[PDB]
Amino acid sequence: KGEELFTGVVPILVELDGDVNGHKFSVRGEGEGDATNGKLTLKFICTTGKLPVPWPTLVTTLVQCFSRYPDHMKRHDFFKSAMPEGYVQERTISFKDDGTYKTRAEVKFEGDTLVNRIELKGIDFKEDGNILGHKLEYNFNSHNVYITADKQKNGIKANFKIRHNVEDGSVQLADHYQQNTPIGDGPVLLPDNHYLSTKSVLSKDPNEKRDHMVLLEFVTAAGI
């Protein structure tokens, strides 16, 4: 089934077209995913020049099918079950006391490559807030992503709070509301309530002159 497509290392392509407060930008990422170890490694470039938002605000938008599900929880892995045809992932991300992102993404195999293609629209951001003011630290906390089935849509929902460290010591909260639905008509696994535990390390490539992000991520399912 879909899980068989993830037994080894899978190439990943990420494409994002964004508009935040009228600032239009694009990001391209390339790397690999190793779901057996729940591991992602990717490098992202802003292909339009300077990114108009902080890189950390785009991490969650920029492939949960790479999560490591323990053997006893494999029947709850919706993400792999939807492959290779894939799924649509939609979110609203509400930054507390600031703007909102709305995103729609399709995650699917194109041959041997797992592709995540995303449209993002951001509105109502404060000009000198933490986002457009670039006041967020270049780091990423560990989170729990809470997943529940959405039987009526043959999919899932998720809700979680991202904590972005601010340079002044405060924390910028980003509330995430997520829904995923299969692209194909084949059967998928609808899960019992559980969560994904995430760990992320953001870095730079010292030889890279373009605006970019190097990302390492480990993600593991738990709670059943």
Ligand X SMILES: *C(=O)O[C]1[C][C][C][C][C]C2=C1N(*)=N[N]2
Q: Which residues bind ligand X (CB under 6 A)?
A: 38, 68, 142, 197, 199, 218, 220, 222
CB of 81 to a second copy, least distance (A): 22
171 contacts a second copy (rule: CB under 8 A)? no
Q: How far apart are CA 18 and CA 22, in angstroms?
A: 9
Question: Closer CB to a second copy, residue 110 or residue 167?
Answer: 167
What are the E-state strand segments in the chain?
10-20, 23-34, 39-46, 87-95, 100-110, 113-123, 143-150, 155-165, 171-182, 194-203, 212-222
67 interface partner picked from a second copy, Na ion, ligand X, none, CB below 5 to 8 A per type: Na ion
Collapsing DSSP states into helix, strand and coil, what is residue 148? strand
CA geometry: angle at 99 spanning 93 and 102, to 5°? 40
Among 30, 199, 211, 214, binds a second copy (CB under 8 A): 199
- DSSP bridge pairs for 102: 92, 121
Q: What part of residues 58-77 is at the interface with Na ion (CB under 5 A)?
A: 64, 66-67
Question: Closer CB to ligand X, residue 171 or residue 222?
Answer: 222
Whether 198 and 142 have beta carbons less than 8 Å apart is answered as: yes
Whether 172 and 166 have beta carbons less than 8 Å apart is answered as: yes
Site string for a second copy, 11-50 (x = CB under 8 A): -------------------------xxxx-----------
Q: How far apart are CA 122 and CA 102, in angstroms?
A: 6
Among 3, 220, 223, 224, binds a second copy (CB under 8 A): 220
CB of 143 to a second copy, least distance (A): 10
194 interface partner picked from Na ion, ligand X, a second copy, none, CB below 5 to 8 A per type: none
Question: Closer CB to a second copy, residue 37 or residue 193?
Answer: 37
Measured from the Cβ of residue 93, the count of other Cβ atoms closer than 10 Å reads: 21
Amino acid present at 65: C
Question: Closer CB to ligand X, residue 140 or residue 218?
Answer: 218
Q: How far apart are CA 49 and CA 61, in angstroms?
A: 19
Q: What part of residues 2-61 is at the interface with Na ion (CB under 5 A)?
A: none
DSSP label at residue 63: -
Residues at the site binding a second copy, with contacts judged by CB under 8 A: 36-39, 68, 141-142, 197, 199, 201, 216, 218, 220
Residues at the site binding Na ion, with contacts judged by CB under 5 A: 64, 66-67, 98, 129-130, 137, 165-166, 170, 214, 219
